[PDB]
């Protein structure tokens, strides 16, 4: 099974550089070209460049020549992309992509969220939101993920086995700290007789927290 492994988040200071890594597995590493793509809300997807691991040959989007440098280590089947002289303009999600010789198939990493900032990494506080004290057909529970930095967090319910009736709200930024929430709606016959737990991952702090929703 072909897999491309990228770190969830990197936080680096403005003016510094960073080497993002992309660990490939499940195929013969030198057979496939490796591409890098930047995603921002403003520009959508931008191709950065590609390296041929066999030859070390590279090619670049004109926009990123002299910003990015692509390399690869064959024995560790890992591709790297170095970004230099970082600005807020470089904060973005960065994907690696392996292009199969079979042009019907390409393989994407999960994307590394790079944040160029001087602010400190802050793990979230995760708070269970049970209903107000005081009955209906169904019940809505919440999970409040407050005061983390940098992005992202991922949130599931019951390890992802509870996915219907779920709403997860994009984070907002305030005073260099993000807050996000999620709601889940179930029937009153399922909660609280069955356990419902929200699971929060904050990759930049290696945080993985579980909060069981308990009645007030």
């Amino acid at each position: 099974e072909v897999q491309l492994q990228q770190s969830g988040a990197e936080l680096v200071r403005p003016g510094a550089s960073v080497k993002l890594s992309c660990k490939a597995s499940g195929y013969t590493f030198t057979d496939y070209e490796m591409h890098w793509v930047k995603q921002t809300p403003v520009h959508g997807l931008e191709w950065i460049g590609a390296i041929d691991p066999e030859t070390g040959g590279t090619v670049y989007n004109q926009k990123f020549k002299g910003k990015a440098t692509l390399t690869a280590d064959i024995s560790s089947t890992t591709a790297y992309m170095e970004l230099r002289s970082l600005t807020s303009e470089d904060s973005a999600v960065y994907f690696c992509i392996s292009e199969d010789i079979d042009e019907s198939k390409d393989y994407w990493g999960q994307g590394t969220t790079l944040t160029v900032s001087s602010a400190k990494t802050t793990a979230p506080s995760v708070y269970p939101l049970a209903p107000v004290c005081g009955s209906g057909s169904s019940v809505t529970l919440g999970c409040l993920v407050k005061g983390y930095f940098p992005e992202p967090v991922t949130l599931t319910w019951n390890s992802g086995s509870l996915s219907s009736g779920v709403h997860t709200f994009p984070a907002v930024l305030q005073s260099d700290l993000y807050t996000l929430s999620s709601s889940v709606t179930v029937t009153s016959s399922t909660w609280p007789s069955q356990s419902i737990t929200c699971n929060v991952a904050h990759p930049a702090s290696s945080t993985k927290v579980d909060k069981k929703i308990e009645p007030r």
Binding site: L45, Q62, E103, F169
Partner: protein, 219 residues
């Protein structure tokens, strides 16, 4: 440096309808050795990597639903979705691979549906948050349509504007509605100075707002 342009940048349709997405390249993508147009289409859903739909401009990737059809040659290409499903909401990107790679600017596909009122739920600070010394009051306005909506907080009967952060979900892939969270953030000291906390949702489905309220000292 081949340039790619997509249109429209966004469009909305009801489920069951057809959509045609256009993509133009600054030069021909046709290779006169392999006889291929090196043009591909990708679907990107929120929070996921893009997935390949069509390559060589018309060859549907195995396992891609039949309703997706690519077409075109030279500089002009089309992605057709012959019957839009609720789960097809996404940004669709074209990508040339003739000389280098270049992505188009994308088309965001949104879905139209009947109006629906929000279901409003209010949440006092958790006891965990209070023991940590903070206090956030949360209101969810769930499964409404259209996306426009207004929230008013009242504290002890009087409007509160400071300290509110609002956040809209992406359109639901199953029922095509929107939801919105509204969070009033106070210090614990400020929370304990007041008693009644109210969130009022005004939506085009009713002239009367939908109101949820609680009193702190009834916890």
């Amino acid at each position: 440096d081949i340039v790619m342009t997509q249109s429209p940048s966004s469009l909305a349709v009801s489920a069951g309808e057809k959509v045609t997405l256009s993509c133009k390249s600054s030069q021909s993508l046709f290779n006169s050795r392999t006889r291929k147009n090196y043009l591909a289409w990708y679907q990107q859903k929120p929070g996921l990597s893009p997935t390949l739909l069509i390559y060589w401009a018309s060859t549907r990737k195995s396992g891609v639903p039949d309703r997706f059809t690519g077409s075109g040659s030279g500089t002009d290409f089309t992605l057709t979705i012959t019957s839009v499903q609720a789960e097809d909401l996404a940004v669709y990107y074209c990508k040339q691979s003739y000389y280098l790679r270049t992505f188009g600017g994308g088309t965001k596909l949104e879905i139209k549906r009947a109006d629906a009122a929000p279901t409003v739920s209010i949440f006092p600070p958790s006891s965990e948050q209070l023991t940590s010394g903070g206090a956030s009051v949360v209101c969810f306005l769930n499964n409404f349509y259209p996306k426009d909506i207004n929230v008013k907080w009242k504290i002890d009967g009087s409007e509160r504007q400071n300290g509110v952060l609002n956040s809209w979900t992406d359109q639901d892939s199953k029922d095509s509605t929107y939801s919105m969270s509204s969070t009033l953030t106070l210090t614990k000291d400020e929370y304990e100075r007041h008693n009644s906390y109210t969130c009022e949702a005004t939506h085009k489905t009713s002239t009367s707002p939908i109101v949820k309220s609680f009193n702190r000292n009834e916890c």
